[PDB]
């Protein structure tokens, strides 16, 4: 109605449930639109995020549409702490998700897991929009078991120097190919490293990659050639594809429609 884009939720049409843990920029919640729909409601924490940048980003963010991508459903800009409105997903970060032991899971759960995040990221590839910070702790877990890509693009406008500088305590150090580490240089090839890095993680259910190290040692290592080795879930047509991710060269790295054809051969394959 009167006052508000097509990118504006009216907050007066949410209703608040539950507490879902915090994240770079506070507080997330449960709780349904016009008391039906269920939502995920941020709270940006005043000084924390580049506003104006991120609602400006906020309307093309509002046309990407994918199965696997949590969606956007709209901001609330009108007062602060601004608001971002998306898609519910009941069963939480994947990381934590996968860290639960009880779930026994099988490889080919796992292996389901992988694609639906290859899935997103061949279409966000396919939007020449990069991810930046790839990984489980990043990735959501629905009430049916399907992992989707979350806060996406985010990165961009996060204004914490420990988050953004490479040497900061907050940066993704160990899911970050040698370019990054060196150089920033930043692409396709860089979510294609961090997408191998994941697939560890969903093998390892959990495990810090590189978990002896601390983060100036896992980018010395990284930069002399050495890599993570094979979770023990990890079939060797598996493994295989996860380190393919891992090329010194970034352009001999896959795309994700490779890895995307890659992951239904072995699928095929395994199952
Ligand atoms: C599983 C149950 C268990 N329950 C126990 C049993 O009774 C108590 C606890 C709650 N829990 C639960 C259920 C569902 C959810 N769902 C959701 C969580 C989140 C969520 C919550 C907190 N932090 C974040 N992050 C984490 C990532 N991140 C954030 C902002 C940014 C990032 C990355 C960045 C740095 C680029 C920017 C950021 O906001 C997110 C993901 O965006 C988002 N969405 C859309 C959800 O649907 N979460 C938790």
């Given at each position: 109605?009167?006052?508000?884009?097509?990118?504006?939720?009216?907050?007066?049409?949410?209703?608040?449930?539950?507490?879902?843990?915090?994240?770079?920029?506070?507080?997330?919640?449960?709780?349904?639109?016009?008391?039906?729909?269920?939502?995920?409601?941020?709270?940006?924490?005043?000084?924390?995020?580049?506003?104006?940048?991120?609602?400006?980003?906020?309307?093309?963010?509002?046309?990407?549409?994918?199965?696997?991508?949590?969606?956007?459903?709209?901001?609330?800009?009108?007062?602060?702490?601004?608001?971002?409105?998306?898609?519910?997903?009941?069963?939480?970060?994947?990381?934590?998700?996968?860290?639960?032991?009880?779930?026994?899971?099988?490889?080919?759960?796992?292996?389901?897991?992988?694609?639906?995040?290859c899935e997103a990221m061949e279409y966000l590839e396919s939007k020449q929009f990069l991810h930046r910070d790839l990984a489980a702790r990043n990735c959501l877990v629905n009430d049916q078991g399907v992992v989707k890509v979350s806060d996406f693009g985010?990165?961009?406008?996060?204004?914490?120097?420990?988050?953004?500088?490479?040497?900061?305590?907050?940066?993704?150090?160990?899911?970050?190919?040698?370019?990054?580490?060196?150089?920033?240089?930043?692409?396709?090839?860089?979510?294609?490293?961090?997408?191998?890095?994941?697939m560890w993680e969903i093998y390892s259910l959990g495990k810090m990659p590189y978990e002896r190290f601390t983060n100036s040692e896992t980018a010395e290592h990284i930069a002399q050639g050495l890599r993570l080795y094979r979770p023990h879930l990890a079939?060797?047509?598996?493994?295989?594809?996860?380190?393919?991710?891992?090329?010194?060269?970034?352009?001999?790295?896959?795309?994700?429609?490779?890895?995307?054809?890659?992951?239904?051969?072995?699928?095929?394959?395994?199952?």
């Open positions: 109605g009167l006052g508000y884009g097509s990118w504006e939720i009216d907050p007066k049409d949410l209703t608040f449930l539950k507490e879902l843990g915090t994240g770079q920029f506070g507080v997330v919640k449960y709780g349904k639109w016009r008391g039906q729909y269920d939502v995920a409601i941020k709270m940006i924490k005043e000084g924390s995020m580049s506003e104006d940048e991120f609602i400006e980003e906020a309307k093309v963010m509002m046309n990407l549409s994918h199965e696997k991508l949590v969606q956007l459903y709209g901001v609330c800009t009108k007062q602060r702490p601004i608001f971002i409105i998306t898609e519910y997903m009941a069963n939480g970060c994947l990381l934590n998700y996968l860290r639960e032991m009880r779930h026994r899971f099988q490889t080919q759960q796992l292996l389901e897991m992988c694609k639906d995040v985010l990165s961009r406008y996060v204004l914490d120097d420990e988050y953004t500088s490479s040497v900061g305590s907050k940066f993704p150090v160990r899911w970050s190919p040698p370019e990054v580490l060196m150089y920033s240089k930043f692409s396709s090839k860089s979510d294609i490293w961090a997408f191998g890095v994941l079939s060797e047509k598996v493994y295989t594809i996860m380190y393919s991710c891992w090329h010194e060269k970034a352009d001999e790295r896959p795309t994700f429609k490779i890895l995307l054809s890659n992951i239904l051969d072995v699928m095929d394959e395994e199952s």
